[PDB]
Amino acid sequence: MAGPLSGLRVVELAGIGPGPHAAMILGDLGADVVRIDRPSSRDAMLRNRRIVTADLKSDQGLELALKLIAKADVLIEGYRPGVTERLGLGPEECAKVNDRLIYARMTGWGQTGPRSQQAGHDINYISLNGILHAIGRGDERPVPPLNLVGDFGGGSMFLLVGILAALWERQSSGKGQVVDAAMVDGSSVLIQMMWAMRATGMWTDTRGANMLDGGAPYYDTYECADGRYVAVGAIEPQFYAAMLAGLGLDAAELPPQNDRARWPELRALLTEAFASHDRDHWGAVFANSDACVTPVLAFGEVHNEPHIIERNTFYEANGGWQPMPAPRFSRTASSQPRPPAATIDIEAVLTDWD
Amino acid sequence: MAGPLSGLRVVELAGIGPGPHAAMILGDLGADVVRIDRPSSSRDAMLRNRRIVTADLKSDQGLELALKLIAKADVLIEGYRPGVTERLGLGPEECAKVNDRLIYARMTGWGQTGPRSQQAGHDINYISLNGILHAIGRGDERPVPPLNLVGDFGGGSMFLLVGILAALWERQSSGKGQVVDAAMVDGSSVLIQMMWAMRATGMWTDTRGANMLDGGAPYYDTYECADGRYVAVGAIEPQFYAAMLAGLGLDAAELPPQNDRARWPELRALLTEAFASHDRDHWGAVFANSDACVTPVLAFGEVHNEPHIIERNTFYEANGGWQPMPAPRFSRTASSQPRPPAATIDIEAVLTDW
Numbered sequence: 130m131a132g133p134l135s136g137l138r139v140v141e142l143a144g145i146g147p148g149p150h151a152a153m154i155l156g157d158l159g160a161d162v163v164r165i166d167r168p169s170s171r172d173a174m175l176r177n178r179r180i181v182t183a184d185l186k187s188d189q190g191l192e193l194a195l196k197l198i199a200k201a202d203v204l205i206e207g208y209r210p211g212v213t214e215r216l217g218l219g220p221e222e223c224a225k226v227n228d229r230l231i232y233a234r235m236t237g238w239g240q241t242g243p244r245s246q247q248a249g250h251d252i253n254y255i256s257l258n259g260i261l262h263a264i265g266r267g268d269e270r271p272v273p274p275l276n277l278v279g280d281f282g283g284g285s286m287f288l289l290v291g292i293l294a295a296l297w298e299r300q301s302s303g304k305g306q307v308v309d310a311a312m313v314d315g316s317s318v319l320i321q322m323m324w325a326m327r328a329t330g331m332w333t334d335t336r337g338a339n340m341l342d343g344g345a346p347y348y349d350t351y352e353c354a355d356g357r358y359v360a361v362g363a364i365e366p367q368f369y370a371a372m373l374a375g376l377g378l379d380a381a382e383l384p385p386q387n388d389r390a391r392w393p394e395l396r397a398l399l400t401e402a403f404a405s406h407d408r409d410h411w412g413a414v415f416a417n418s419d420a421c422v423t424p425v426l427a428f429g430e431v432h433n434e435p436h437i438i439e440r441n442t443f444y445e446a447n448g449g450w451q452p453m454p455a456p457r458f459s460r461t462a463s464s465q466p467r468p469p470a471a472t473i474d475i476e477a478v479l480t481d482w483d
Numbered sequence: 484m485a486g487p488l489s490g491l492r493v494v495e496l497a498g499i500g501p502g503p504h505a506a507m508i509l510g511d512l513g514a515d516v517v518r519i520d521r522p523s524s525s526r527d528a529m530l531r532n533r534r535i536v537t538a539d540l541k542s543d544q545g546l547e548l549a550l551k552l553i554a555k556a557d558v559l560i561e562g563y564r565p566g567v568t569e570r571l572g573l574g575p576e577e578c579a580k581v582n583d584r585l586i587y588a589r590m591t592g593w594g595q596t597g598p599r600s601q602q603a604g605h606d607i608n609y610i611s612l613n614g615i616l617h618a619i620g621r622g623d624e625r626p627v628p629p630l631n632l633v634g635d636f637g638g639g640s641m642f643l644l645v646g647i648l649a650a651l652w653e654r655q656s657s658g659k660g661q662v663v664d665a666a667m668v669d670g671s672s673v674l675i676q677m678m679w680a681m682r683a684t685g686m687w688t689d690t691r692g693a694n695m696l697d698g699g700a701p702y703y704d705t706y707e708c709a710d711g712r713y714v715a716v717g718a719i720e721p722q723f724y725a726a727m728l729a730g731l732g733l734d735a736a737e738l739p740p741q742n743d744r745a746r747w748p749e750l751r752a753l754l755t756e757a758f759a760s761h762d763r764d765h766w767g768a769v770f771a772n773s774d775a776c777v778t779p780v781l782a783f784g785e786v787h788n789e790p791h792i793i794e795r796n797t798f799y800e801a802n803g804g805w806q807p808m809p810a811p812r813f814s815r816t817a818s819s820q821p822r823p824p825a826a827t828i829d830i831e832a833v834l835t836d837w
């Protein structure tokens with residue numbers, strides 16, 4: 130198996146959202162990933178796995194599972210607190226059969242506290258810690274950033290950092306431990322820059338009035354003549370100057386880049402400029418530029434973008450394109466993901482593993 | 484130094500955004516983090532858990548001090564355009580000669596090669612190219628940037644972290660380091676792999692504001708309350724949706740079906756009128772301890788008053804401002820409270836200590 134995590138062994142108890150995403154990235158980087166689902170696969174998030182079923186409520190299902198776990202490095206579970214305990218797959222049961230196991234618990238609200246038993250999804254976790262309120266236009270209700278910030282960014286990715294930091298700690302101590310990854314925590318660390326900026330008077334709680342939330346005319350999207358969009362991210366004054374020259378705009382006509390009181394007016398001037406040509410035109414004009422102006426591509430166009438094609442950021446599978454592994458490694462390179470490995474028998478795996 | 488990454492030694496060539504966010508988290512988890520800034524130069528909490536040092540790397544003495552640190556360290560982080568470290572004398576090849584155990588971590592937006600590899604850019608630019616930006620915001624309006632959460636951090640720093648830590652695990656076999664190439668355009672593509680999966684199997688359109696998780700579903704969105712503040716609704720599962728309806732006072736019999744997309748306009752109007760009839764804190768009461776997946780959308784400034792946030796110590800206080808505590812959490816080797824940014828140190832003192 131290709132990648133820096135060759136021969137890492139990972140047991141995944143099937144769930145949704147973050148736990149499966151973390152398992153995927155582990156797979157992607159060469160880990161041996163076995164996912165236990167329940168007797169009751171077309172999701173490419175299940176790439177780079179062996180799938181096995183087992184009623185974990187049965188006596189045998191439990192016993193089989195504990196044999197897997199005994200032979201593994203990492204266990205991932207993404208159920209509400211208490212769930213794995215009741216199955217007899219809790220951290221303490223696992224530590225009897227393998228004091229080396231990294232026990233990885235993926236929740237939204239965490240392991241304890243008043244909301245620990247509440248159902249939730251991404252939108253709920255990011256609502257509570259200030260993140261969701263900060264996203265969208267000011268004259269309007271907050272908009273969910275898909276499920277990128279709670280499930281993945283502040284979720285799976287923190288589970289991963291935890292699984293791999295604990296594997297490092299293990300090398301010097303010989304012992305596993307429990308990783309408690311809560312989306313409400315990770316997503317808060319994910320947005321630490323805003324907490325830093327608010328502390329130094331450089332971020333408000335007003336939506337749509339900030340450097341990076343879309344309120345700044347040099348950090349936003351603009352509609353073009355054809356109804357498609359560009360993104361502008363020209364924060365540094367020299368990039369900003371370069372953009373203005375490429376728009377045909379004389380800097381003397383315009384309010385200061387960072388006079389926030391005149392942003393409305395600046396925006397109107399830039400709006401009229403971008404509107405006068407189509408997206409492709411601006412993509413051309415600004416190629417090789419430090420003006421920080423890029424075409425906003427829809428998913429279906431991404432496969433036609435030179436920089437995407439030539440770095441092979443995607444590969445063709447199945448119905449269509451999928452992201453290749455990340456990040457990239459010079460010596461032990463990941464390989465192209467294996468499609469979801471149709472259900473094998475949990476005994477097979479055990480023989481294969483000893 | 485507390486945390487699972489105790490012992491880990493890290494050199495960070497000062498940059499902006501992902502590079503320092505990665506460095507911070509390593510610090511957060513116990514790593515020993517030394518940051519080399521240029522002398523043309525702390526109230527940014529993103530530079531917590533650091534020793535800072537000065538050094539002109541353009542000078543001959545600068546370079547060789549730098550090169551000593553690198554020799555005695557496990558990890559190098561740099562986030563400059565490709566070719567910059569080379570032309571400084573700090574490239575991978577030069578580093579591999581004073582320390583072949585080094586994890587050489589390269590944080591960019593566009594990657595190390597290809598047509599955009601020298602273009603300046605920010606978060607909004609990298610997510611504009613891979614389909615992400617286009618998918619965020621309401622359907623009748625231009626895309627809205629999800630702050631810099633998806634490119635810089637979730638799809639940037641966090642992949643840098645996984646790469647560093649995956650390579651550290653690899654260096655337990657081979658005894659040799661390697662080059663980690665983390666590009667935001669790639670990492671953020673893996674961050675959104677779910678949408679690429681659903682797109683392949685007909686469960687996600689390219690139409691902004693018309694999907695299950697982008698705000699198009701009346702049961703996964705925010706709603707404005709009587710007081711002009713908001714709640715989040717994430718009631719995807721039918722059981723949770725039913726619980727929400729009951730709390731709202733709406734009879735399922737009078738509403739269109741939850742997933743009859745063609746009648747979402749009606750459904751949304753009904754839910755809109757219901758949520759609008761009481762204030763956010765009413766709904767907060769009604770639904771606490773419920774599985775209805777309704778939470779208050781708090782602003783940053785109110786987060787410190789939320790019981791579940793307080794009790795799990797998701798935040799700590801520092802220098803007039805709350806800041807996030809490290810994530811994730813570890814049962815045995817817990818992280819400490821982060822130390823504030825430390826006034827500078829002489830690069831000699833550090834080489835001694837090491």
Ligand SMILES: C[C@H](C(=O)SCCNC(=O)CCNC(=O)[C@H](O)C(C)(C)COP(=O)(O)OP(=O)(O)OC[C@@H]1O[C@@H](n2cnc3c(N)ncnc32)[C@H](O)[C@@H]1OP(=O)(O)O)c1cccc(C(=O)c2ccccc2)c1
Binds near residue numbers: 184
């Ligand atoms: C955008 C969105 C997301 O945000 S995904 C992230 C959702 N949040 C979390 O994951 C946080 C932690 N987990 C939970 O809070 C719950 O898991 C629950 C999701 C609320 C469901 O609650 P429940 O259904 O009540 O489950 P539970 O955790 O309470 O326990 C159920 C268990 O089932 C039993 N058993 C488990 N394995 C087995 C087995 N092998 N054999 C037999 N039984 C098993 C356990 O014993 C336990 O049962 P109980 O004893 O306690 O009954 C998101 C992201 C991605 C996808 C989705 C979709 O919904 C979706 C759907 C279709 C297409 C695309 C997406 C949503």
Ligand SMILES: C[C@H](C(=O)SCCNC(=O)CCNC(=O)[C@H](O)C(C)(C)COP(=O)(O)OP(=O)(O)OC[C@@H]1O[C@@H](n2cnc3c(N)ncnc32)[C@H](O)[C@@H]1OP(=O)(O)O)c1cccc(C(=O)c2ccccc2)c1
Binds near residue numbers: 498538
């Ligand atoms: C939301 C937003 C973000 O998205 S942040 C992420 C931006 N993207 C990246 O980071 C990816 C890779 N990097 C770059 O593409 C460039 O770095 C550049 C920043 C575009 C432009 O930088 P340039 O100014 O051209 O620098 P360069 O990297 O090409 O080369 C600079 C070098 O400087 C020299 N030298 C370095 N160290 C030393 C030293 N110790 N002594 C002497 N010289 C040194 C090198 O030699 C080289 O110079 P040259 O030889 O080539 O001249 C974001 C995130 C966070 C913050 C911000 C803010 O802007 C902000 C600002 C204020 C408050 C709050 C936020 C924005």
